[PDB]
Amino acid sequence: GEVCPGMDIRNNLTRLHELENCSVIEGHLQILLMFKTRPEDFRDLSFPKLIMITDYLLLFRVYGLESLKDLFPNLTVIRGSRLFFNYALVIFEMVHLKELGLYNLMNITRGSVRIEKNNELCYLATIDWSRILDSVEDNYIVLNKDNCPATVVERCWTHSHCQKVCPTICKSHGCTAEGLCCHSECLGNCSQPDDPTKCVACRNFYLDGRCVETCPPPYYHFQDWRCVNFSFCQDLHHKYVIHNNKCIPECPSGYTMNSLLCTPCLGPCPKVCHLLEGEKTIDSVTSAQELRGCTVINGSLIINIRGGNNLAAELEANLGLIEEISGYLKIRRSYALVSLSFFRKLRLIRGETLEIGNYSFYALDNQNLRQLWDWSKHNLTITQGKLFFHYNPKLCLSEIHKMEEVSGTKGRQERNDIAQASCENELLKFSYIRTSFDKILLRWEPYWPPDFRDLLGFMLFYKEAPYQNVVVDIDPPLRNHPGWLMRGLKPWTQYAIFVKTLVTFSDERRTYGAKSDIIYVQTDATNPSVPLDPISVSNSSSQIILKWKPPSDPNGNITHYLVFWERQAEDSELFELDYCLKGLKLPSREEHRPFEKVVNKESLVISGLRHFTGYRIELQACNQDTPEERCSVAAYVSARTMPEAKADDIVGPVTHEIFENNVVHLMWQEPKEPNGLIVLYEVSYRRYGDEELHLCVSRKHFALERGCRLRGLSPGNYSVRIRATSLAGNGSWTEPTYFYV
């Protein structure tokens, strides 16, 4: 089973004879506008080797065809890799077609059927497409003229060309011409059954006449269809790249070449956007959004932005895609923009495309900008052509100087190119600052213009400056050294601060300006807030896996968790109350607190404690660890450990003594590390032949009656059992006591 590419044929059937050496058409077969042909051309002209078409078929004004079987009787499958309008075959407007009669069609891996206007063409509704085509949404069949397996009527391409319905067990993998299934790797048909080497079309991959699940390089994977040697991969590449061991036409997104391996790139891809006309004018965001991602280009650009307030965040996401522009770039009449910097990579106008007048940049009527670039840490250069800046004197030549200097363009312009004048002729200097955690001093001096009258004070702007990704006024001093303090700040919070003069607008001699400095400044740290999530979880009787979480206010570089705990003296109410009612009424609930500077742990396993014992916890949050510390008011909890099923028990049997009048006096002992505290003792007693009866003994009852006392007992051998009850519950019973009353 050979393979050949699939092309179209317009009015020249002569190329059909080239299919004799082909069994698979790696593509389609498109035959159109054959006013030349006649029935003699196609009545039996056959290429039985052809067995499958990857993409589709087409047949229009094909004057002469009698039966579709004639050309390719063995045609079995259509992979439909690409499908004209998701269709597999065009049969339209041919009166010569008497039938299709293709007695080998098995499956259409993708697409539906089209037939129309073909007179004399019968046996179309007889087709049961349900088993053939994976897509049967609309098997368009209209205006045509229209023994074998029957489904609901006999299903067949002709009364003789019975439908080749394989047994259901063959699946889409197909069956031989005799109806015997093929191997799972096969598809449609096979010269011999159940043999991956004898298939006609492959489920996974055709390899050197044999179907294979995977393609072994240099015979890499070919479009889920076959295997192609790496040399042929390069041949396709040059006139196609290895990905997932597959010589796919091009690498996926985020990939880069590795001579023909698809090694991942940095994510962004340097796409070389050969601009429409080499150009695109820019005034509105939609334009840039449309062209997002042009990490590389071929052309110049034109700019007329419409920006006039603090809204540039919308913009640079589309911008800065390249470090250079091969051609020019033009801008004019842009709106009140302040920054001409938000263009990420851009570094060099190659200016190859020259602006009119052999220019390579232009700027005019952009009398708006007051920020251009951070050439201080950014590099500029320009290759060729005149550059135009005139009539944008919002920012004057002051920084222009820098621009042409760093661009190396001194010899490429004249003053003609260049020209509200916010061009600060001076830059004030800060003198002194002092810092609290939230309120910071400033100091400077009686600066004055020579016409000191011109000064109107000073305009501050600042902001919190946790990171270096990238608001008040003052009046003049007197003849003297001013300063400033704020409060709005917060502990250990970096802020960028910077001022410029409030000055008189001296019209013709409008003073050009007295800037100031810039400073990233962080306030003092302070005592943090309370650390939250205080949960004193118990991993063991005497072990507490305490857990918290940071405070609301670190107020400085966090240093340690100054934990603090203490055992609680259990409530005296439990030593005062009595609970001995049937249906027990059991209750329910210096000093250096032991501590630790728990650091980097939001939790702690506290040891040496007592099961189910009251403990008061304390933890000051401290971003300082010295003896004196910025420590927050502590977090607290009255933690209680987990109990034990030994601390509410009674050791040994119940100590007893008896009197002749059938009076029993009882005594016993308790553990001295109870589950918090033992408050009462369940009591039970029995005489042989009788039944056990229950009673309670509280600690007060324990003291008054040395434990428990019983009166009016029936004579005979006696027994007693007592169980201590702590606030964690009941423990273990005493060993069965025995005595005679």
Partner: protein, 130 residues
Amino acid sequence: SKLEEIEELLKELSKTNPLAKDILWVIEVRTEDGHDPKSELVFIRQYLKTLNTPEAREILKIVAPGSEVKKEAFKAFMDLMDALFLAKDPEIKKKAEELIKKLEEADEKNNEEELKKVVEEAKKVYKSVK
């Protein structure tokens, strides 16, 4: 009709979507109008282009099979398949020759927008043919 079926399955969808409910409101008010159903339909489709939320796009596709556009483009292709050789002027035939290539391209690239533009242009050219 199948448009009534669209409306009923839109009842179903609106029961699974608020926006479909708003569309049903639109439908009933249009019924009040009782004007060309297809005109109002196409307008609402363009309104979906307008709102064009992911959910709006999904709903549009549901009511606008998109492959609907594929069938319509196939019909335009039949038009051009007649035109490129049977057109009334050689210029029309040459433009159709360009356009068949353009359509093969668009089919491979299968962009709804490219295909829309191609079919609109195809209608524009077929104006001369018919």
